[PDB]
């Protein structure tokens, strides 16, 4: 058995248990991935490596993460590119920016990526985003083109609570996003 | 209160290494916005 | 608020969330700090920095740790030097060996050490151990010379269960060691 | 069952930095022994 838990209800300016990449930084009790500025990227990783599966026994971990986030854009017609929660190898570095969200480099299945991401995509990229052009929540496996998406209406400046759970008995990854209003 | 839920089967063991790091990413392009996280909790259990 | 919690009931050969120093290594489900070999030192650190007090609020963390250990010596009259549980700065490296337990460098109070250790001392060093020459449990703050000690009868090869708790409200550190028989 | 208990007041704020690393140490000299840990749990709460 091996378990791991953590809870941060407020970020320190010197948050030693996190790894920052791109523009990520902590400010005012909050974690800022990007400020409202053009063409930039920011990532923040929890520094402990997590034991996800055991080659030896074939066991896979059960896990759940909860977080509160905010997207603050100039207007509902001027917003891009999005935000993700992702699982990747221990030495992960930012990948392509823009519509690739700093996590993937192609819409084609890249088995070397070894990354799973839950995206909250606010900008429609014709090459791989759902046809309906709506903003959406998507589950990404080794590629920027989602294996499953759900339309989502961005509430600008509002706080969303998200819960992401993985049931190992089942292999099912569940994502719930909630707004107060 | 407005909610959204999405489910999918993902075979973790075949896509990610035994050991991984978890985190958040965000980007902007010609169009942009600020992205920030206010709180974060996590729990995992292997075996 | 921040909380951190972890449990390891069996050690992996590749325990990526631990930092090993000296001869420490994992093997057979167990963490080995030293083999029964002369003049050696081993250390193992949890890799994540822990936030113990906050500058700002002046708050101090409450914490509790529990572990099972065994000391296996050739015989009851041939056993040295001991084992410790310690709290140190993030960059901590092994300090002097032998009677210093890999964590201190002197019997004089050293403010720059910034290390608190709970020792399980099996060998009487005349320069600073209790005069009774008994093996003992001790609480060490910036020095190898304990602030408080308790005689302890080593049960050679037996698994000891230890609980170490810190109550931020009273600043009281408590140590309990238990043997089955 | 046989147990031992010890307690001491330790003003942590004045001795250790705000962020620390926790771990185990063991050494041998001319006399020696094997030192092993079989399991380890840890819980801290700041605030
Ligand atoms: Ca997009
Ligand atoms: Ca000694
Ligand atoms: Mn998308
Ligand atoms: Mn001593």
Curated annotation (Swiss-Prot), chains A, C:
It comes from Lens culinaris (Lentil). Mn(2+) binds at residues 119, 121, 129, 136. Ca(2+) binds at residues 121, 123, 125, 129. The record marks 180-181 as: Cleavage. D-glucose binds at residues 81, 99. This is Lectin beta chain.
UniProtKB/Swiss-Prot annotation, chains B, D:
Transmembrane segments: none annotated. D-glucose binds at residues 29-30. It comes from the Eukaryota. This is Lectin alpha chain. It comes from Lens culinaris.
């Amino acid at each position: 058995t091996e378990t791991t838990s953590f809870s941060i209800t407020k970020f320190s300016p010197d948050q030693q248990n996190l790894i920052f990449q791109g523009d990520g930084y902590t400010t005012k009790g909050k974690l800022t991935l990007t400020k409202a500025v053009k063409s930039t990227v920011g990532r923040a990783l929890y520094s402990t490596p997590i034991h996800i599966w055991d080659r030896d026994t074939g066991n896979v971990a059960n896990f759940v993460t909860s977080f509160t986030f905010v997207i603050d854009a100039p207007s509902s017609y001027n917003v891009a590119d999005g935000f993700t929660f992702f699982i990747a190898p221990v030495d992960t570095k930012p990948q392509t920016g823009g519509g690739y969200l700093g996590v993937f480099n192609s819409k084609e299945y890249d088995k070397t990526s070894q990354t799973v991401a839950v995206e909250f995509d606010t900008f429609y990229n014709a090459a791989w985003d759902p046809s309906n052009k709506e903003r959406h929540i998507g589950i990404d496996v080794n590629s920027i083109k989602s294996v499953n998406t759900k339309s989502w209406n961005l509430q600008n400046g509002e706080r969303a609570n998200v819960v992401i759970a993985f049931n190992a008995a089942t292999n099912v990854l569940t994502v719930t996003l909630t707004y107060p209003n | 209160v407005t909610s959204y839920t999405l489910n999918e089967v993902v075979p973790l063991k075949d896509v990610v290494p035994e050991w991984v790091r978890i985190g958040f990413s965000a980007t902007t392009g010609a169009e942009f916005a600020a992205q920030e996280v206010h709180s974060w909790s996590f729990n995992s259990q292997l075996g």
